[PDB]
Amino acid sequence: SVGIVYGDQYRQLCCSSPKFGDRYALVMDLINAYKLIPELSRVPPLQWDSPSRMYEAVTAFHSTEYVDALKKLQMLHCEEKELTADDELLMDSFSLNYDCPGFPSVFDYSLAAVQGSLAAASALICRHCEVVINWGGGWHHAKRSEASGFCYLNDIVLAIHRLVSSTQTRVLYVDLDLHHGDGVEEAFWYSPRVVTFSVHHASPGFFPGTGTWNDNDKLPIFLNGAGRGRFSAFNLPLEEGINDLDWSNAIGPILDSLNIVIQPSYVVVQCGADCLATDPHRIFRLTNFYPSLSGYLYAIKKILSWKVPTLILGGGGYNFPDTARLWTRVTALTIEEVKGKKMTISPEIPEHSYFSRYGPDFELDIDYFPHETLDSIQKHHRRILEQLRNYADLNKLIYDYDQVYQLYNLTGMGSLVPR
Amino acid sequence: SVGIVYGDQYRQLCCSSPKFGDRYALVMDLINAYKLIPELSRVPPLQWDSPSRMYEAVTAFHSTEYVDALKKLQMLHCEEKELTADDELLMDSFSLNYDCPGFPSVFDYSLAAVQGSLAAASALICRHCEVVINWGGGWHHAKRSEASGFCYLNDIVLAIHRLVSSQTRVLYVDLDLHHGDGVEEAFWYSPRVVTFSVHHASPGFFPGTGTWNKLPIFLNGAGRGRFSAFNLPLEEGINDLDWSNAIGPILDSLNIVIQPSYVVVQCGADCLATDPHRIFRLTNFYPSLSGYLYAIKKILSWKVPTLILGGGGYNFPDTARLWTRVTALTIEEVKGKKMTISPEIPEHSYFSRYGPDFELDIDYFPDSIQKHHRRILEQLRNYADLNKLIYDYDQVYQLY
Amino acid sequence: SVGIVYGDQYRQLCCSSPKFGDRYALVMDLINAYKLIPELSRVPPLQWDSPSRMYEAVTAFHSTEYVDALKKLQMLHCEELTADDELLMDSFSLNYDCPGFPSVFDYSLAAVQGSLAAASALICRHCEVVINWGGGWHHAKRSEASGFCYLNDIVLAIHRLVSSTQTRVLYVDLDLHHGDGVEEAFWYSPRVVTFSVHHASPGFFPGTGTWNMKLPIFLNGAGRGRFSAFNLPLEEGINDLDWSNAIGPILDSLNIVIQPSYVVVQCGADCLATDPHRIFRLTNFYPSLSGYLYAIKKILSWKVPTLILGGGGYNFPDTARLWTRVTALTIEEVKGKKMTISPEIPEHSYFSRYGPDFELDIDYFPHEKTLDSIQKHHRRILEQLRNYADLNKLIYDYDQVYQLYNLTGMGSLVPR
Amino acid sequence: SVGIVYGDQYRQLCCSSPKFGDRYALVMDLINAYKLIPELSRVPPLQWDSPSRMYEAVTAFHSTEYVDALKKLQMLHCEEKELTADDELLMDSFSLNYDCPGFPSVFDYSLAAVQGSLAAASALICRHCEVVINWGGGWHHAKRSEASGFCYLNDIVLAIHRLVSSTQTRVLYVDLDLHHGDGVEEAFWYSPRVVTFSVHHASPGFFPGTGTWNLPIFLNGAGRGRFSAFNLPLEEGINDLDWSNAIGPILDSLNIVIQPSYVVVQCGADCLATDPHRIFRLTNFYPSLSGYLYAIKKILSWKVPTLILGGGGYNFPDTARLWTRVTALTIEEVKGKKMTISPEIPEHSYFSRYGPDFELDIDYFPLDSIQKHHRRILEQLRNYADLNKLIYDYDQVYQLY
Ligand SMILES: O=C(NO)c1cccc(-c2cn(CSc3ccccc3)nn2)c1
Ligand SMILES: O=C(NO)c1cccc(-c2cn(CSc3ccccc3)nn2)c1
Ligand SMILES: O=C(NO)c1cccc(-c2cn(CSc3ccccc3)nn2)c1
Ligand SMILES: O=C(NO)c1cccc(-c2cn(CSc3ccccc3)nn2)c1
Ligand SMILES: [K+]
Ligand SMILES: [K+]
Ligand SMILES: [K+]
Ligand SMILES: [K+]
Ligand SMILES: [K+]
Ligand SMILES: [K+]
Ligand SMILES: [K+]
Numbered sequence A: 001s002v003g004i005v006y007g008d009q010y011r012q013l014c015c016s017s018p019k020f021g022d023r024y025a026l027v028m029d030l031i032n033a034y035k036l037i038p039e040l041s042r043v044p045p046l047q048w049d050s051p052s053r054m055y056e057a058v059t060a061f062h063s064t065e066y067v068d069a070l071k072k073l074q075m076l077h078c079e080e081k082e083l084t085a086d087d088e089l090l091m092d093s094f095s096l097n098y099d100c101p102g103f104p105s106v107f108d109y110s111l112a113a114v115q116g117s118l119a120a121a122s123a124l125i126c127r128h129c130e131v132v133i134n135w136g137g138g139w140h141h142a143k144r145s146e147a148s149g150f151c152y153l154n155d156i157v158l159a160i161h162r163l164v165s166s167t168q169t170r171v172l173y174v175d176l177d178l179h180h181g182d183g184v185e186e187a188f189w190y191s192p193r194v195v196t197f198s199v200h201h202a203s204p205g206f207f208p209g210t211g212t213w214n215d216n217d218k219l220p221i222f223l224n225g226a227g228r229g230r231f232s233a234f235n236l237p238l239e240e241g242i243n244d245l246d247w248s249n250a251i252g253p254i255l256d257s258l259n260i261v262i263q264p265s266y267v268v269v270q271c272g273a274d275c276l277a278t279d280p281h282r283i284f285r286l287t288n289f290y291p292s293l294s295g296y297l298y299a300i301k302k303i304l305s306w307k308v309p310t311l312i313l314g315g316g317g318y319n320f321p322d323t324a325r326l327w328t329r330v331t332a333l334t335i336e337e338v339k340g341k342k343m344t345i346s347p348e349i350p351e352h353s354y355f356s357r358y359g360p361d362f363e364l365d366i367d368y369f370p371h372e373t374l375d376s377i378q379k380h381h382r383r384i385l386e387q388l389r390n391y392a393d394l395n396k397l398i399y400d401y402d403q404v405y406q407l408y409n410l411t412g413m414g415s416l417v418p419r
Numbered sequence B: 001s002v003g004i005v006y007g008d009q010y011r012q013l014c015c016s017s018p019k020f021g022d023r024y025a026l027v028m029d030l031i032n033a034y035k036l037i038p039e040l041s042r043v044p045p046l047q048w049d050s051p052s053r054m055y056e057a058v059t060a061f062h063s064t065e066y067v068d069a070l071k072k073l074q075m076l077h078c079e080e081k082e083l084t085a086d087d088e089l090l091m092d093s094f095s096l097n098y099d100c101p102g103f104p105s106v107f108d109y110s111l112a113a114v115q116g117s118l119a120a121a122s123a124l125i126c127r128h129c130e131v132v133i134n135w136g137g138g139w140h141h142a143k144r145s146e147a148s149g150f151c152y153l154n155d156i157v158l159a160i161h162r163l164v165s166s167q168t169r170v171l172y173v174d175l176d177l178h179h180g181d182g183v184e185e186a187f188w189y190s191p192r193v194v195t196f197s198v199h200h201a202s203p204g205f206f207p208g209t210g211t212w213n214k215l216p217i218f219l220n221g222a223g224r225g226r227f228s229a230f231n232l233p234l235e236e237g238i239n240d241l242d243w244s245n246a247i248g249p250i251l252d253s254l255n256i257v258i259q260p261s262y263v264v265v266q267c268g269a270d271c272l273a274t275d276p277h278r279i280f281r282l283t284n285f286y287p288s289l290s291g292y293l294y295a296i297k298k299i300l301s302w303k304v305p306t307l308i309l310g311g312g313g314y315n316f317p318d319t320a321r322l323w324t325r326v327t328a329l330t331i332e333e334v335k336g337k338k339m340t341i342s343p344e345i346p347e348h349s350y351f352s353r354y355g356p357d358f359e360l361d362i363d364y365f366p367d368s369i370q371k372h373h374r375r376i377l378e379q380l381r382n383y384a385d386l387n388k389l390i391y392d393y394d395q396v397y398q399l400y
Numbered sequence C: 001s002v003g004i005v006y007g008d009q010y011r012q013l014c015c016s017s018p019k020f021g022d023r024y025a026l027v028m029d030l031i032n033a034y035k036l037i038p039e040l041s042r043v044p045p046l047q048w049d050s051p052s053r054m055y056e057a058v059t060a061f062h063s064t065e066y067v068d069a070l071k072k073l074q075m076l077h078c079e080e081l082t083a084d085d086e087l088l089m090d091s092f093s094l095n096y097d098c099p100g101f102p103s104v105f106d107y108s109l110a111a112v113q114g115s116l117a118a119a120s121a122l123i124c125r126h127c128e129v130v131i132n133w134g135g136g137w138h139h140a141k142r143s144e145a146s147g148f149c150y151l152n153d154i155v156l157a158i159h160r161l162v163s164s165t166q167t168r169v170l171y172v173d174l175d176l177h178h179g180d181g182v183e184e185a186f187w188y189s190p191r192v193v194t195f196s197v198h199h200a201s202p203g204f205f206p207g208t209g210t211w212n213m214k215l216p217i218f219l220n221g222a223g224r225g226r227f228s229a230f231n232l233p234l235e236e237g238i239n240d241l242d243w244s245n246a247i248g249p250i251l252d253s254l255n256i257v258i259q260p261s262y263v264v265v266q267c268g269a270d271c272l273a274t275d276p277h278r279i280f281r282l283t284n285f286y287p288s289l290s291g292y293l294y295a296i297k298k299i300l301s302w303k304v305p306t307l308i309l310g311g312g313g314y315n316f317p318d319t320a321r322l323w324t325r326v327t328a329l330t331i332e333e334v335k336g337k338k339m340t341i342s343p344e345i346p347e348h349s350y351f352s353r354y355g356p357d358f359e360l361d362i363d364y365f366p367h368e369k370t371l372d373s374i375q376k377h378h379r380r381i382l383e384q385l386r387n388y389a390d391l392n393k394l395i396y397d398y399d400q401v402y403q404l405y406n407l408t409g410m411g412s413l414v415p416r
Numbered sequence D: 001s002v003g004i005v006y007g008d009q010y011r012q013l014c015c016s017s018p019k020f021g022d023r024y025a026l027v028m029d030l031i032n033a034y035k036l037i038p039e040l041s042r043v044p045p046l047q048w049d050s051p052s053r054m055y056e057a058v059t060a061f062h063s064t065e066y067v068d069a070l071k072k073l074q075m076l077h078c079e080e081k082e083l084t085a086d087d088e089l090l091m092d093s094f095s096l097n098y099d100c101p102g103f104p105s106v107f108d109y110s111l112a113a114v115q116g117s118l119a120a121a122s123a124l125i126c127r128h129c130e131v132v133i134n135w136g137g138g139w140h141h142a143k144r145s146e147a148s149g150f151c152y153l154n155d156i157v158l159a160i161h162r163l164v165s166s167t168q169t170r171v172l173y174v175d176l177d178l179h180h181g182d183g184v185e186e187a188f189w190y191s192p193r194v195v196t197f198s199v200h201h202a203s204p205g206f207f208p209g210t211g212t213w214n215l216p217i218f219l220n221g222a223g224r225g226r227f228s229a230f231n232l233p234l235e236e237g238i239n240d241l242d243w244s245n246a247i248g249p250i251l252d253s254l255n256i257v258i259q260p261s262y263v264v265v266q267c268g269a270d271c272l273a274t275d276p277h278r279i280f281r282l283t284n285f286y287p288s289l290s291g292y293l294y295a296i297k298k299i300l301s302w303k304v305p306t307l308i309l310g311g312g313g314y315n316f317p318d319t320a321r322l323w324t325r326v327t328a329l330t331i332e333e334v335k336g337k338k339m340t341i342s343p344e345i346p347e348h349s350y351f352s353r354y355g356p357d358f359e360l361d362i363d364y365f366p367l368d369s370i371q372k373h374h375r376r377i378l379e380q381l382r383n384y385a386d387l388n389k390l391i392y393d394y395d396q397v398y399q400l401y
């Protein structure tokens, strides 16, 4: 069973923010227009039996004072009067400003993603679904008491906490967004049982600034967790311009090696679409092509081949029609891999009420033409495999050198694997 | 609303240089130890959506080749190998040497101050704050294609450029011991940015400008910027009261005549009597009254949106002592809210650096100007004539 | 007497082309709004007593087959072309930047009418200077339209001047572009000395007026006209002061050696810093002094009868701002009568075109060298002037040219 | 109309290089001697309103650093002194050496061909002309940042780029030169909307080395451009008839399947039997029918707006003889007006260069491999149409062979 989170009120709330507009509606209606919905189990967003129960769920990660302020922010925007000087100071102390402003539905909107991702986690735990998709979740930047990067509540952290607390259990978090998954990495910085791995662009002044090299008389180093969590936070920063094949070859062996050594009970994937070549960021050059294979589809197919219960989340993606094109192909691929059932998608966009948003071509492939020794990252592979070996030793896990070696030897790079 | 620039990454980068060490941490922790943080709105440093957007922002003033060299200098210092002869020549061509050497974070460090001061300007433009403080910025010596005086990127120029491009005039006031040459040069041809620096000048003293230039005279701008660059050089040894009487009437007449839309103040603390320069004898005393606090209170009385920046200051505990009082004064004047600072340094992480006395007061025992006033008043009349500005000449004469 | 060409029908025709729109109207109405018109003598455009007399006048330079085709082009646009018609027009470059429109012949002829009348007013001594802001079309060739120019009013005016009763004419071309049509017309003629200052670079219109690439050389005329065509190409970015210092000594030297009976000045405004070409950085400032006003003031100080023409200029309000100052300066220098121009644009029906500032100075902020000098061009040009004087058996007053250049310590550049 | 690029400055620049001498003047003076100029619309070379505009046009393909170096090379060759060691190294890094040395007009000469072919493309886009000829263009070997084979700037790539960006638009490029058209092929390697087709000699060690087997296989494009680059390499000694039958069905198949909006033809004359290469044996005969005239007549029969360019040709009078007949044929096919050309060269300034016989015909007395290439090319065209979701009659196309 492949699950997908949706509902009537859920759709309205996910489409109520000023930044993401109707993106969620385009995504779900394109999935529906390609007749995928009858193949999927609807997973209803979680609801609670009291305000105290909802508050207890959200403050499993976020501070009480931060949740109080976010609810007040919504109350204030639902009325006419402006904020007092002391209300402004309170909101500024939680970064509820700039890129994370208030709007009349800001609390309900943020809470909805939490409701959907917690429901998704519960459907994996009780083995009702082998995979669950939530295209309304994936907000990786929010911190315990701080909004960041259009993210107000961290549905990912709360979903992972539910998985890891169910009954040895380890979770592997994989972050494919253009940006570093800083909020999820920070929440589990001291926790060996949640291993985080983000691949992303990093460069001076590019948001959020972390996930890359860190005094004046020593070579830079990668921080990678602390305390009991030492060696448990992984990062691969990449330069701008990377294409499908080079991104696939960059993360593929690393993903396979993480699965071999960590042996996770659950995988959580953030699948932000802002690495597409047609995203207005224009930083990476990934596609949604499916023969010349989309880096995204290569990575998802590899993750699903492990047969580990998996949560697939959304995230960034600022070309709304092209984000829908990618996530529709991810959804079809998940059905095929899990159910063994061929899913044939017409190259022409089907009739539906958002059809006119797919112009001028009205085709499923994004409108991009890919075009092309010293840009390699073999020293990153070596650094990351040494970190994985250190993680295994610290946590008294089997490090199967022979299997990791043969994996890397498939591409002639077995010498990078440490013993 | 009074804003202040800080953040966790910002703090680590502002403390990553060899010359300034952990100064920014002492400053912000003393402000926090005196319970001033809850009175202030945190302004997060600006971040960009692509490398191209960052480059476009910095090269609004600096040349692309200089920005390229500064980034390569950081990369080269993150590897063990020595520089090649060709790379040494490249860095020399941009003065990335001597007092502006490379180190492993030199580009991220320099850019951080630009991110802070651009966010500060935007907070003023959108009216979120009436005043914004950035003690990580104020690097007034860097030029279009040249590092100078421990300054690599000119965050002040970029901030002012954002302000004027939002009829808009900016008044720039430079209180540092040293002449603010980079900012003056950037706006040498611009009448809408009036610059005014007070500083020590004497033969061989850095950077050499801001003073008399067959016979000698004062240069003061060019083209349509003629008469728009003001300077007051002072002899060594000046105390709070004489420095205050020197600058006070000039500040008041500049505001009256120019009517600025924004004021930008560089508040470098190397004029303190206890700075190792030991050139001027200013204090942080708040009843003699600190020359710094006199100037800031006067500027804030104008009720013009204002950016307050850092700069020099090489006695790090006494720089923190001064800038903590400047921050409290700004809260008082803008919000109308009394601030009571204990004369004893409160216990906190850096308490031991304030020994052996642990007081907030620094440990100190406290016709040339008339001519400069006549010259500056004449220059201001010439500036107003050239720019068709309305001003009661006998109202501004009586200030002096 | 300072004359200026205008009239009611003339204004309509000069404002009838697709490229230049109402520019001539803005120029003359700004001159009128500053109250300069009562100081000037109106010079009416020349009219003829028959079609044959008009045709004879135009074909003093242009070919009969080119004039015939230009007349037919207007006729056709007053009524599609046949394939033979299209071939005919293409053979004369009556296409691309020089297309047809319903008034193309009358429009082109009008500039000729104005500049011929201007020349006659100088010849009979009615005016000491005449201004024609509807003329100055320096690119047109004897059988070819070029660069928005269909008929060469400058060539026809110079021909009238030089054939009036040892007469030599000095032509000075200040336009951004090389004055190739005028230079070509008089290539074999020693009695018309042409001097153009301009931008030149690879691919920039029209391509001539620079090195011909043995090291490259400047071509400078041929036959009896050898050494009589002068050129100074300049790199982009030059400001008022550097342009003034570039051409000032060369102009003074040309006057000393040539001793012209008439000067003709093309004053195209596309060197302004605010022209959309954005190549040179000249201004109209008058205190840091406009290069144009510096050069006009110098030329008028010679006290030689002078024709001042327009030409390029694609920021129409800023072209009017410059040419209004040129007009006031000409009155001041010739009459000795102070002309005070208010910095605020006066009320008139084109007032709204001068926003958002509504001031007379162009809206530009000048800003800022050792290697960009052109002293070898000065040396080359003075050698050419010496060669011209020797070929034509004219006095070469070395002492005077030397003292001129030694005012800036550059007397060593002058050849013996 | 039929347009042709010329002008006095254009003529001077096109005649300023050491390799091609006054070839362009012979071509245009023979066309004029046969009284063809009144039948043709003159297309003036493009000029720009600033250096920045020129640079923007040229760097639509070429790198800024390469254009900077080519301009510097001209500057350096306009002075007396030798190059410094540092400047020699700079020029070497762009292959501005060997067969692409500097000379006093090298940048203005190279830019002139770009000016002409861009103006030719604009005349087709605005529909002033149905066909435009530029015998000063056709420099197919230059790359983004590399000079090659006497080519410094690629006027063909820049012209094709203007054509494809004008409105969906598809361009068919046909390269008849003795050499493989590698620079144009490479520029559009990833682009399905520009289909390139070169017929050429290829053999071990022969310039430039590409356009042939790479069990070896033909590379044919990449990405969305897979199957969009076509090549036909031919053995030395081939005659008019065998070359015509080799390419004739390929050309018709491409037009039927691609349905191009524009055709661009490179017509380098170094396949002539009398070219000093002496590799192929084509003629300019118009009764044995010139392979060049066969191909041009076929392409013009499609009634698609067409650009005809020059290229190689190192026997200058015989190149003029061929291109004069190409020009007369273009007028005939487009206008439907017969062009009678005397078999004897007319009197004109260059008459003495056509001795000792002074005739218009060049002075020349005139298998399983090709069938294998045809099967391969047909399979590639089927793959191209499938990948690009184009509809075509499989047997109507195969019938052509
Ligand atoms: O995706 C994110 N985090 O994972 C995230 C976090 C912070 C900021 C942004 C964001 C989005 N946009 C608008 S798209 C656009 C981008 C560049 C140019 C023009 C439009 N700008 N910044 C996204
Ligand atoms: O602040 C500045 N510009 O605004 C600036 C610019 C250039 C140089 C310096 C500087 C600082 N120090 C160390 S303090 C010290 C001073 C005197 C004796 C012993 C130590 N030495 N030179 C500061
Ligand atoms: O003045 C001339 N000869 O003396 C002359 C001759 C040929 C062409 C042109 C001309 C004018 N414009 C439009 S202005 C403009 C220029 C650059 C960018 C944007 C607008 N474009 N080309 C002027
Ligand atoms: O045409 C070309 N590319 O399309 C091209 C490209 C590279 C080189 C050459 C070239 C020309 N010549 C001299 S002719 C000759 C040929 C053989 C023997 C004697 C003289 N030699 N090589 C032409
Ligand atoms: K990521
Ligand atoms: K962890
Ligand atoms: K100062
Ligand atoms: K200034
Ligand atoms: K000129
Ligand atoms: K002459
Ligand atoms: K070929």
Ligand SMILES: [K+]
Binding pocket: D188, D189, D190, D191, D192, D193, D194, D195, D196, D221, D225, D228, D229
């Ligand atoms: K192709």
Ligand SMILES: [Zn+2]
Binding pocket: A177, A178, A179, A272, A274, A315, A316, A317
């Ligand atoms: Zn993102």
Ligand SMILES: [Zn+2]
Binding pocket: B176, B177, B178, B268, B270, B311, B312, B313
């Ligand atoms: Zn200082």
Ligand SMILES: [Zn+2]
Binding pocket: C175, C176, C177, C268, C270, C311, C312, C313
């Ligand atoms: Zn012009």
Ligand SMILES: [Zn+2]
Binding pocket: D177, D178, D179, D268, D270, D311, D312, D313
């Ligand atoms: Zn060839």
